[PDB]
Design a protein around this ligand. Sequence first.
Ligand SMILES: Nc1ncnc2c1ncn2[C@@H]1O[C@H](COP(=O)(O)OP(=O)(O)OP(=O)(O)O)[C@@H](O)[C@H]1O
Ligand SMILES: Nc1ncnc2c1ncn2[C@@H]1O[C@H](COP(=O)(O)OP(=O)(O)OP(=O)(O)O)[C@@H](O)[C@H]1O
Ligand SMILES: Nc1ncnc2c1ncn2[C@@H]1O[C@H](COP(=O)(O)OP(=O)(O)OP(=O)(O)O)[C@@H](O)[C@H]1O
Lengths: 40, 213, 523, 37
Amino acid sequence: MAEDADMRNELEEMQRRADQLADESLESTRRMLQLVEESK
Amino acid sequence: DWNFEKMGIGGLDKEFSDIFRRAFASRVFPPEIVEQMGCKHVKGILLYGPPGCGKTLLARQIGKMLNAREPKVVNGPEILNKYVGESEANIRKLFADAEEEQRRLGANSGLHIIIFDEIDAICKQRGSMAGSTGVHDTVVNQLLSKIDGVEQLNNILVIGMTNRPDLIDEALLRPGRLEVKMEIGLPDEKGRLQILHIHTARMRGHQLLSADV
Amino acid sequence: DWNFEKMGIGGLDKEFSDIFRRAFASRVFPPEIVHVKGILLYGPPGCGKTLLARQIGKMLNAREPKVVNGPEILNKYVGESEANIRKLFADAEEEQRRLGANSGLHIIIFDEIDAICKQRGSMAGSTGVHDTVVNQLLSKIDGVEQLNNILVIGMTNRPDLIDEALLRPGRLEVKMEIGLPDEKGRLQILHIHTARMRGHQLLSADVDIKELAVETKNFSGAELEGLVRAAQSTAMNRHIKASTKVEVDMEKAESLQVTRGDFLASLENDIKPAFGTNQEDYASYIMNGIIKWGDPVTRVLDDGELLVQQTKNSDRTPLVSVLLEGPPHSGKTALAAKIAEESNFPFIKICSPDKMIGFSETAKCQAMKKIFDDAYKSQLSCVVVDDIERLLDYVPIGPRFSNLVLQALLVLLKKAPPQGRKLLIIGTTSRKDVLQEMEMLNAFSTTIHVPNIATGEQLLEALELLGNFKDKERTTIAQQVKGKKVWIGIKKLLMLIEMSLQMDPEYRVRKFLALLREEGASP
Amino acid sequence: ASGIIMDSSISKQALSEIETRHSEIIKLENSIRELHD
Ligand SMILES: Nc1ncnc2c1ncn2[C@@H]1O[C@H](COP(=O)(O)OP(=O)(O)OP(=O)(O)O)[C@@H](O)[C@H]1O
Ligand SMILES: Nc1ncnc2c1ncn2[C@@H]1O[C@H](COP(=O)(O)OP(=O)(O)OP(=O)(O)O)[C@@H](O)[C@H]1O
Ligand SMILES: Nc1ncnc2c1ncn2[C@@H]1O[C@H](COP(=O)(O)OP(=O)(O)OP(=O)(O)O)[C@@H](O)[C@H]1O
């Protein structure tokens, strides 16, 4: 949809980025904690 | 490769002569005398009339004869957007390549055409409505500022058509913005004959028309 | 410079000098003996505001002026408008800090400032983006930190939309109105734009710039430039011929002289002033002049002259009225208009029912009241009412008429004007048998009579003054009308003369006499 | 008493605050992976 589609995609990808990257960071922290506890 | 006969417009012969006289006289003339005369080319055309005589056909054929870049079309009011202050972002995206090529190639730039279809949907009188939003005023202000602002832009040509001339705001029709304005109306006997001859050439080409017509 | 003209501007010389006096005087004045921050411009479209802004920026030796092209500050993200607005004054604040009161002057251009400034944003803006933006600008310009090295110029084509809050002292101090130039300004603009022509003698000597300046009325500079451009385009296209292909002689091209004919064609054909025109039609009430077919005309005109003299030179009779009586189709309106014209008074008007079709009683009363009220302003004036019987529409059945209009007329006929002023009233009517019944004939001071043609000699004299028949035709007319009565009005006589010139010459006189006999009668 | 009217609405993307910066935690995991190795 030209400019309309461009903006809709931009904002949808922005919400995506937010949620997905937050979840990925949470998973990374989980793995970090698990390995740190394992080494002991 | 151009000729008036190739164009399908018939019955509108004075109008085209006037448009050519008042719009393309300067560009065709050799540059030296033009510079010696120190004149500025026109930057607008307006067309109006009752529903359906020659408007869109004339605009398309005019845009299809210049050996310039492809024109940019705007089908009705497809500029509006639902986010705050984004109609302007779409308006300014039209007059974008023109400024860049003005900066790059000095004063030998080509010609850029913009065809505003149904211009009365966007550019109404300022403060006319009593609605709950004020996007139309900002759109009109941005268009007025960009068409002729402090920075001189002189390699564009804007064409507009409508069915209601009186609704346009006067500030958009002062000599310099949209000066040449024309009226297309019903034809007469010679015009009718020319039109019927234009639309019946191909059938007569291969003898598909009976002799008694 | 202060040339007032080297910048290609005209008509604002006095206001340009006033700007010099009121804006930059403090900067010009020596610092030993010792500002303006807000300048606003307004005027109708096409007057030269942007030219003033550009020349003002160029004139002073300061940094390059900054510009904003309409609403380039709005954004869809929260808080970006304020950041963009505050990005502007960083240099001003830094220079203030660095150089105290020696900071260089700064110029900020707000083109089409109406886009930002308005009476608050609409409720459906989802926030106060408009109000918060205007408040941020107001605080920055009028903050507690007071700078003296910034000048802001605003321009708009419609001042009524600017919020009043920004027009108070300390924000917008100077206001300028740019109006329509004058005849001398038109001459100056034409000279500026035709200097390039006159440099190479490409303009025909047949052109008189004074005539053009006289002709162009209510033209702004842009419209005059358009006229000149149209003339140039016509002159250029005279030498081009592009119907099969684009072609130019290239030999008979040097002449290329724009002639007065080109200017006239451009003015008449493809330009419009964009302003209305005043209409004058009072010459349409006398379409055939006045011819003295007899003595009575002289007496009527003499009485009118005496009445005018009395009203002018009287002391305790500021108001005078007269009635013009006569049979139908006798030419009473023409004589009344003539007598009004001969008075040479500053104010004259004609009240007729031709302009009131479909009006009710109240509208007629209001219109007559307006006309008389206007007439009550000049020192001495004359007013004429014709076809009274059609003003209070009267029909012999019943009879039926309008009471409100009759009472309005009877009240207005005996109301003196303000102290030391003179008014004259002339009324015309064909049937006086009714006005005497309504008691409206006693208000008028005096009455004059207008007769019909009553003798063959007068008819023949009128024919001669018209010059239609001759020789045996007139001789036979005389022979047949030297022992008969004639009762014809001049208008009816003209109608008959027009009627009888449609058949062949053999039957013309017979047809004319037959028509005269048919229409002839006695009182 | 004329009345009974309507209106239109617009919006604004107010969550401008960035989030990508705090999501680039991969390098710390890489370092601790090297430590575990
Ligand atoms: N003068 C003409 N010569 C040749 N063909 C014509 C002429 N006028 C109309 N036509 C034919 O009829 C069609 C009319 O459509 P056109 O694009 O001219 O409409 P329009 O004037 O833009 O209409 P609207 O009333 O919607 O503004 C043209 O495309 C062409 O097919
Ligand atoms: N008094 C004048 N002297 C010289 N040129 C003038 C004058 N008035 C108008 N013009 C011409 O008209 C144009 C002036 O318009 P400009 O672009 O400076 O802004 P403006 O008149 O404020 O515009 P707007 O119509 O948008 O309010 C230029 O072409 C200028 O040559
Ligand atoms: N000496 C004259 N006196 C009056 N009218 C004259 C004379 N010579 C020529 N005319 C023309 O005769 C016509 C007079 O018509 P006019 O409308 O004045 O008549 P009227 O008697 O007032 O009409 P009505 O009966 O319709 O009220 C006008 O064209 C006037 O120019």
